[PDB]
């Protein structure tokens, strides 16, 4: 992550993130909107950052210092660009929106009102069906890439060694290779759970509780999808194993 | 240190993320109780073992049944919970989440922990269901659930009052490390 978009999203809520005399500006149920859509930015924010670790530190560091056989990385990190694109994308417009609501003269006092169009978008038409595929494609590569990684720092004394290297900061104890796939699996299903709590506190306009309740119908309509289209690839399995399946 | 992983499982309305919170920041938040519970790595010293605990919740995985299993790879210690509000969250523990995390992870200590005991004696609780013909889990009805699934032990807490909560995760440990 940036310096600048760690500051913005360092405190643990929205009410500690603007200065007390705008808070005290907010009624109750605004304050309670605004806390969840920070804690929805502020975990986005996290999710790009995870991908960063996965892309930058892990598999661009094992191609330029180790020898691994062609198609190793790919299998350890199966989609991280195509996942980094679309969340990168959607944290830019999340923080464009962060922005533009700004007061004039301030860094961190503003309040979003118009959320659910971010959504509806984000969740519909050609950014859906990417993210669809997209976590079809990982989902069902996730059990593949943990056995890969496994064998690798059991056998490999180089792969051992950079990983040791890499993963020994503190700032990296939550993130190392297999804890860095499995929060991306995780992700999608946090997102309906953080959009139907800002729902609850999006009554005052009548269009934002329209506009979150359809985002939320088309964020659980792309987990049905991807749910449904998941099936476990295993290396060396055979044709007779996938047919009776 | 040796590294061993948690996964909580139970209904929606059981309290699992709320606990992961509470024993994580070792404060029940005065400001703001997040949504979500990303992960967490904690430092504990059990009976004079040092062990890093890689902490997962289930959240929002509850009605994806090729999404959730991708969470049991490797676990060492399942926390499987039900809510002491809410005979209903006990009554899926034997024939839906016992037998799933039987299957993924076999050989694996369950430890069925009943959250919320704090509303056990709860008047707004007990009057509410009273309605639908039910009161509070009793300790009794706990153990006995516990028994019949097999689990490496049972055990309460509140993550509101911060009760019970450390206990558990100390216990999870010395069963992961078994
Ligand atoms: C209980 C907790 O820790 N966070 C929280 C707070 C409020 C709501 C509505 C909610 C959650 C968690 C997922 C379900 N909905
Ligand atoms: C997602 C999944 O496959 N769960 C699973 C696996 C195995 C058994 C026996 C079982 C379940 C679900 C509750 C009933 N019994």
Redesign the pocket.
């Given at each position: 992550s940036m310096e600048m978009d760690e500051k913005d999203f360092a405190a643990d809520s929205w009410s500690l993130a603007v200065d007390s005399s705008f808070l005290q500006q907010h009624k109750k149920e605004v304050m309670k909107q605004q806390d969840v859509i920070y804690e929805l930015i502020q975990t986005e924010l996290h999710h790009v950052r995870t991908l960063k670790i996965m892309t930058r530190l892990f598999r661009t560091g094992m191609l330029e210092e180790l020898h691994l056989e062609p198609g190793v990385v790919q299998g350890l990190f199966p989609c991280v660009d195509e996942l980094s694109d679309i969340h990168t994308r959607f944290l830019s417009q999340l923080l464009e929106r962060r922005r533009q609501a700004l007061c004039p003269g301030s860094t961190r006092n503003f309040v979003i009102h118009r959320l659910g169009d971010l959504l509806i978008s984000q969740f519909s038409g050609p950014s859906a069906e990417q993210m669809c595929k997209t976590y079809s494609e990982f989902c069902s590569r996730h059990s593949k890439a943990l056995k890969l990684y496994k064998e690798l720092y059991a056998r490999d004394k180089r792969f051992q060694q950079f990983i040791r290297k890499v993963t020994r900061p503190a700032v990296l104890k939550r993130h190392g290779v297999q804890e860095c796939i499995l929060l991306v699996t995780q992700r999608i299903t946090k997102y309906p759970?953080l959009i139907?709590?800002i729902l609850?506190h999006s009554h005052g306009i009548e269009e934002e509780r329209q506009d979150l309740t359809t985002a939320l119908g088309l964020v659980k309509e792309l987990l049905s999808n991807v749910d449904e289209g998941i099936y476990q690839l295993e290396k060396g399995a055979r044709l007779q194993e996938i047919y009776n399946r | 240190a040796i590294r061993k992983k948690l996964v909580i499982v139970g209904d929606?309305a059981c309290?699992k993320?709320?606990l992961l919170?509470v024993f994580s920041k070792d404060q029940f938040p005065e400001v703001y109780?997040?949504?979500?519970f990303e992960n967490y790595v904690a430092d504990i010293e059990v009976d004079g073992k040092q062990v890093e605990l890689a902490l997962w919740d289930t959240?929002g995985q509850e009605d994806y049944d090729r999404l959730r299993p991708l969470s049991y790879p490797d676990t060492d210690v399942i926390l499987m919970c039900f809510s002491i509000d809410s005979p209903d969250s006990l009554e899926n523990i034997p024939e839906k989440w016992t037998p799933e995390v039987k299957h993924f992870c076999p050989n694996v200590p369950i430890i069925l922990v009943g959250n919320k005991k704090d509303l056990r004696n709860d008047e707004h609780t007990r009057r509410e269901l009273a309605k639908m013909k039910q009161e509070p889990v009793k300790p009794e009805e706990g153990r006995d659930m516990a028994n019949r699934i097999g689990a490496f032990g049972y055990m309460e807490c509140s993550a509101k009052t911060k009760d019970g909560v450390r206990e558990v995760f100390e216990m999870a440990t010395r069963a992961a490390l078994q």
């Open positions: 759970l139907s709590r609850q | 929606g309290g993320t709320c919170i109780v997040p949504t979500v959240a």
